[PDB]
Write a protein that binds this ligand. Structure first.
Ligand SMILES: CC(C)(N)c1ccc(-c2nc(Nc3ccc(CCN4CCOCC4)cc3)ncc2Cl)cc1
Ligand SMILES: CC(C)(N)c1ccc(-c2nc(Nc3ccc(CCN4CCOCC4)cc3)ncc2Cl)cc1
Ligand SMILES: CC(C)(N)c1ccc(-c2nc(Nc3ccc(CCN4CCOCC4)cc3)ncc2Cl)cc1
Ligand SMILES: CC(C)(N)c1ccc(-c2nc(Nc3ccc(CCN4CCOCC4)cc3)ncc2Cl)cc1
Lengths: 280, 280, 280, 280
């Protein structure tokens, strides 16, 4: 059924599936080996594919993710699309491999020992990735620690574009009902007003920072998602994590302004975060 | 709520609403006069706006239509977006005025007297408009006679982009359930397979030709939409209209091939239709 | 395609279509004559049917309306389902005929002369109809003046159940995104919280009262739907119509309490409205 | 946010969470102990709850499942709803515990040794459960081996009602787009025609039988979900599993008739399956 794309197509015989990296929401990812880089030698990659119980939504999400990674482009703070097996056979999305795993699990481990200087660097990389994304006119809609992978040598890479959208010409004003996004990372306009913008992503980024500075802590601790709907309206916000500069918490609190225009842009988070690193 | 766009914004005091051109599915259009073209004099235009009972879908559709007309661009066989009043007040979408009305009502009238040479010219213009649209990577999804307007001097213009989509980077494979498109103009893959492509639009164009050559006739005469679901699967198609070249009916029948890839592209319909006109 | 229902099926030869009563959102209604009541003589009825450009949504809405009117039952303040032509041919929904037309247009006319005593009676009937509906565990979701018909002798009848739902066992908590309901009649939880209950309908009823006491006035005069989203959050409400008891406006204002549980039930509106009538 | 239900409410202090039984699609289930049966002693139960990354869909699904289990009722071949913690705190759905696990994993294990007589008994129980469900006017929409649990003493229990629907008064004709159902278990009308009936469930049951008689085999072996769309149209079906009576395969093949009305009802599968067991 799927159409063809010559520039991205990759021969099935040059791929050898292996150890399953983990099951997802609309499929699963397994470790693999692919012959084709321009050296033409075996480099380790990750292959996202469907399961037996796949639904049409699962199918459409994975295809969407493949199509998003193509328009986004090449960047070091995001996982790059290497190749894909679409023609005659099961869909395979070939992306780069991240040896350390996901940011959440990574952080919760080292609590060798990790430093504060690292956390600011870690956050800065992510700010850079999101700045680029926003420049490409793409809204992620699912920014979280679990969705950030870390390779060998510790490079921060934003992953999982199954829910991302192309905002180049269309913004989906009053069309995005956002019922499939995790509530604890959603901005108020996303939850109640049927809209999603770059400013909505900065809110989520704010929550991402909290996860980092708590070493993989779960947002709104002790507060179930079901009561968060009214609390968010009341103006409730999370408090400062013991192990965070008073300048950092103000950045978080800034991403959490009820009014979208009053929140900082990703370019701003880049400049300000760059400053703090130099003075660390 | 709506963001701003300087290049397209138009002052409310320079607009004078008037005679209602007709009610639609998600609002209504009225005749107006606007001072701002670069002469700076009063030119007649059409203003699309919401009604009192507007829904959020109605709202989102109209905004979508405005955003689509911006990425599509300037073309003579499509109604151009002139201006828009978004800032502080009711949304107003200012597009050009078509004096004769819609193709369907237009055709059903003259049955002075109209010629066959006209019908081929009429169809050719439409083929040109759709070729351009496809080039801009836009799928209309609602091509029909009622959605084609004709100005003074008889220029064919494709209108109503509330259902159109941007296919530049994303195609919506297995996501488009297409429940809001008129069934008698829908291609089989659109109705059953959760997809919509340029080839799907050629099918609809095929039905548009039938409407033209029957002088505003209603597709599948005597067949209710409710039984069309099974008939379309059986391979049922419409027959040749008495007042149509045997070469024309083959073009229609070609747009109606169950397999999308076996249908002609819009560029082909351009070349072939151009040929027939010269020999008319 | 549609299944069969013996108890409601009505022979096509005993029906004679006629004057079109008006076009709708998902079809149209025309005046007709049907032989079959138990006298077996020609009684005037209204037939709801699809148009040529019908969509699958239009189709599904009309079928839904037919199925809703069956579970709701027999009541004088609601338009009753008389019969239906589903088997072999175009779907026809046969409901009773209302000679005066819709409440909105009706009211805007007489502004012979109508009295205040009438308006309270008119509102009381509607309160009775909605009480019954709520008892049948049905949420209308589209209560408005335009959706209330008035027969000969002036009986108030609630119509148009295409958007109504069955709440008997399922309530659709966080599933109802409500994007197809007119915003000026929607309750805040309906617009922002992805829920709809009987309390949501009382809000709409509150707006219905305003329409009545303004003689077919348009809600939130001078305020476009697009700015109503923020105003509703601010706590903005409509003010008292000159030609309304100070006791009435308090009932309206009571249907408009931000908290659903603080609004009056339909049974309460019945008792209180019954009181005022006796003292009029 | 969630309303209250006295007859089903269960005190949080009388529940002790424990070992996680496994993660799901919209939450997770953990083993627990609850004091309240009418003995008033500690009985093991299973608690379905949300995770930190829960979405509004996840939330709405779990609530839907709780509401479905209430209207369905008490039956031995389905997992019964014991209690629920909704008021003030995280939503907890308390259902009965199944010690052996899910049918799929169960079967794939014993391939002590299991007999053919068992498989017919196993299939018969499931036929009984589904007959009852259909009687209650509920469509499961997700019948599969993975969704059938087996308790101690080997009783077959149908689980996971997050996707189930109430068909009592409404059937959702042309409304059910079914994009969240696993394709390998879907009936053709479900996949292409926007409908779902009891006959659609018999198809899935047909696939369930295949899973049983292959000892937890994966449907359409070697055929990826992506090519199944065209194959299903071509009339392709699965072949007889080596370890299945020629009378059984005919029952499967009967559930797989393209025309819904030509498939057997659940009552029929009950009578016929009951016959074969007696002669085993
Ligand atoms: C979102 C989701 C779930 N679909 C998902 C899951 C995995 C990935 C992913 N993971 C890795 N690399 C990697 C390496 C080690 C481990 C750790 C695995 N773990 C360690 C502990 O023991 C059990 C296995 C995990 C991942 N590389 C690329 C990608 Cl694209 C992306 C999305
Ligand atoms: C799709 C829909 C309905 N929303 C819709 C409706 C109208 C238009 C539209 N119509 C005109 N010009 C025009 C001129 C005359 C008549 C004829 C009007 N008619 C003639 C007979 O007497 C009654 C009025 C009709 C239109 N110009 C621009 C536009 Cl954008 C577009 C879409
Ligand atoms: C919601 C919608 C639009 N689909 C719709 C439209 C019409 C009805 C409806 N209308 C009537 N009776 C009636 C009588 C007179 C007039 C007045 C007609 N009007 C008067 C002025 O001149 C032009 C025609 C209008 C209606 N009876 C039963 C029904 Cl079920 C229901 C819904
Ligand atoms: C659909 C889904 C996933 N959400 C899901 C998951 C679990 C259940 C469920 N499971 C059990 N009992 C049980 C006992 C043992 C094992 C085996 C667990 N397994 C064994 C092998 O080692 C690892 C753990 C599994 C389940 N009881 C009641 C319920 Cl309601 C229902 C749905």
């Amino acid at each position: 059924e799927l159409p063809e794309d010559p520039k991205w197509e990759f021969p099935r015989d040059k791929l050898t599936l292996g150890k399953p990296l983990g099951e997802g929401c609309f499929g699963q990812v397994v470790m693999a080996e692919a012959v084709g880089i321009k050296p033409k030698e075996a480099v380790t990659v990750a292959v996202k594919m469907l399961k037996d119980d796949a639904t049409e939504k699962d199918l459409s999400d994975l295809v969407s993710e493949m199509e998003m990674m193509k328009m986004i482009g090449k960047h070091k703070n995001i996982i790059n699309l290497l190749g894909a097996c679409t023609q005659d056979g099961p869909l395979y999305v070939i992306v780069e491999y991240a040896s350390k795993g996901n940011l959440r699990e990574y952080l919760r481990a080292r609590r060798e020992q990790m430093t504060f200087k690292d956390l600011v660097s870690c956050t800065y990389q992510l700010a850079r990735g999101m700045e680029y994304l926003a420049s490409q006119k793409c809204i992620h809609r699912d920014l979280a620690a679990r969705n950030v992978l870390v390779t060998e040598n510790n490079v921060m890479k934003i992953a999982d574009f199954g829910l991302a959208r192309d905002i180049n010409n269309i913004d989906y004003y009053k069309k995005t009902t956002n019922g499939r996004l995790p509530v604890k990372w959603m901005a108020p306009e996303a939850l109640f007003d049927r809209v999603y913008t770059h400013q909505s992503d900065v809110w989520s980024f704010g929550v991402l920072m909290w996860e980092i500075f708590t070493l993989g802590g779960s947002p709104y601790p002790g507060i179930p998602v079901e009561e968060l709907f009214k609390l968010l309206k009341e103006g409730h916000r999370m408090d400062k994590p013991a192990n965070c500069t008073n300048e950092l918490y103000m950045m978080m609190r800034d991403c959490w302004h009820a009014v979208p225009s009053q929140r900082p842009t990703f370019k701003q988070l880049v400049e300000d975060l760059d400053r703090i690193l130099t003075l660390t």
